[PDB]
Amino acid sequence: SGMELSYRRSDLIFKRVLTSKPTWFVRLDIDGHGGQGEVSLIPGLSLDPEEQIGRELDLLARRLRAEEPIRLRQFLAERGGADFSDYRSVLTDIAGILDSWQVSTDGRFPALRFALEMALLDLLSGGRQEWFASDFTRGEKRIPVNGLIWMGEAAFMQEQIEAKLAEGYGCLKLKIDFDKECALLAGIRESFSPQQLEIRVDANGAFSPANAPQRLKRLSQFHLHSIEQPIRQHQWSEMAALCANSPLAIALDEELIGLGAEQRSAMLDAIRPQYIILKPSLLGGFHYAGQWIELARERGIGFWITSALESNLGLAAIAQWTALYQPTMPQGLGTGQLYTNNLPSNLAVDGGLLGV
Known part of the structure; x- marks a missing residue:
């Protein structure tokens, strides 16, 4: 039946x-x-x-x-x-x-x-694991992707950066105590210019509505691409003020989770962020992530797609979907040996480009 x-x-x-x-x-x-x-x-x-x-x-x-x-x-x-x-x-x-x-x-x-x-x-x-067929799945196109770096000793951070640049990356993500971090960022910028290296930082709601403004001013002097989710979600009014006064572009991530129907446009209208980051598994899929993209496009808000720790199965599906938008800016994808038991895959990253 x-x-x-x-x-x-x-x-x-x-x-x-x-x-x-x-x-x-x-x-x-x-x-x-x-x-x-x-x-x-x-x-x-x-x-x-x-x-x-x-x-x-x-x-x-x-x-x-x-x-x-x-x-x-x-x-x-x-x-x-x-x-x-x-x-x-x-x-x-x-x-x-x-x-x-x-x-x-x-x-x-x-x-x-x-x-x-x-x-x-x-x-x-x-x-055949061809969720979305395109030049990407046929190996005729690749997706630009950013690399990761971790806050550590000045010389090791210089070493990781050298590694990624030699690997072909032009954009690196760094998760961000603060004074040490700024000094390290200053250190990074003395050896690597913005034209040579693009840096996106991720705060994961670490800042408070209090220290955020000053900190965003402080970080803006390192010529960063953007800062992700400065303060904790569910604080629309505080975030809207941050996005309105900050010389550093703000990208929302966690803020989108759980929002549905009219709540989505309401959040975008209220905060007016510079960017939003789409993580399909957290949003309920491609249909919903696609609707978020159209909402952003309608309001002149930028965006990029990223993985959310899925296995290579989910990663492949997300990359195939991402490829449909023909991204010019680096996307948060790419192979990342994080597990001992991932699924075998044909995905590979070289020259800062993800392909099959």
């Missing part, structure tokens, strides 16, 4: 007691073809309650076995071509199916929503 949803929990173990991150691999099978997706959680950040993912998957499997997949079959047939269909339209149809399957219809299980969206995209195109 129905179809089959199967899954396996296989937490990704962080490379060296061992620690791991909750992750499930999901598969949809119907009429001889299958599609794969990944449920990726970041405890303390992702909205999805870890202890309920399993039951949500079991409840969906039961539902899918009990009903005739009439709407899904029509979707697979109608969008089978795709040459004659935009990905925005495909994602809209998928959202309709996910809604009918009662998947995160209240936005409480974004990672699950994303995993199932991934599975349907893969199912539609053949189960």
Whole structure:
């Protein structure tokens, strides 16, 4: 009568007691073809309650076995071509199916929503892990990506930077106690100019509405591209003042999580950020991340896409989607051997460009 949803929990173990991150691999099978997706959680950040993912998957499997997949079959047939269909339209149809399957219809299980969206995209195109086909998947185009660096001793930081530049990166992300950090940034700028090296810093809500203004003035003198989420989310009024007075561009990240429908435009209208950073697994998928992009475009707000610790399966899907926007600025993607048990992949980074 129905179809089959199967899954396996296989937490990704962080490379060296061992620690791991909750992750499930999901598969949809119907009429001889299958599609794969990944449920990726970041405890303390992702909205999805870890202890309920399993039951949500079991409840969906039961539902899918009990009903005739009439709407899904029509979707697979109608969008089978795709040459004659935009990905925005495909994602809209998928959202309709996910809604009918009662998947995160209240936005409480974004990672699950994303995993199932991934599975349907893969199912539609053949189960070849070609969520979004393009010059990228054919290896005819690459995506510019930024590298990472970590705050440490002056000479080691000089060493990491030298490493990345030799590796081809032109943009590096650094997570940012403050006085030491500024001095280090000053140190960096004496050896590396902005034209030669672009630096984005990430505060992860570390600053307070009090010390933020002065600190943003202080950091703006190092010619940085932008600072990510200066203060903790849910402080629209304070953030709007920071984005209005800061000579350093501000990019929102955590601020987008949990916002839905009209709440999204309301937040953008109120804060008027210079940039927003899209992390699909935290937002509920490509359909929703795509809507965020259109909201930003409508208001002249910049944006870039980044990974959120997913395995190489999720990373591939996100890179394939990102490639559709033909980005000119560095994106937060790229292989990052962080786990001991990641999935084998054909993704590679060289010259600061991500390709297959």
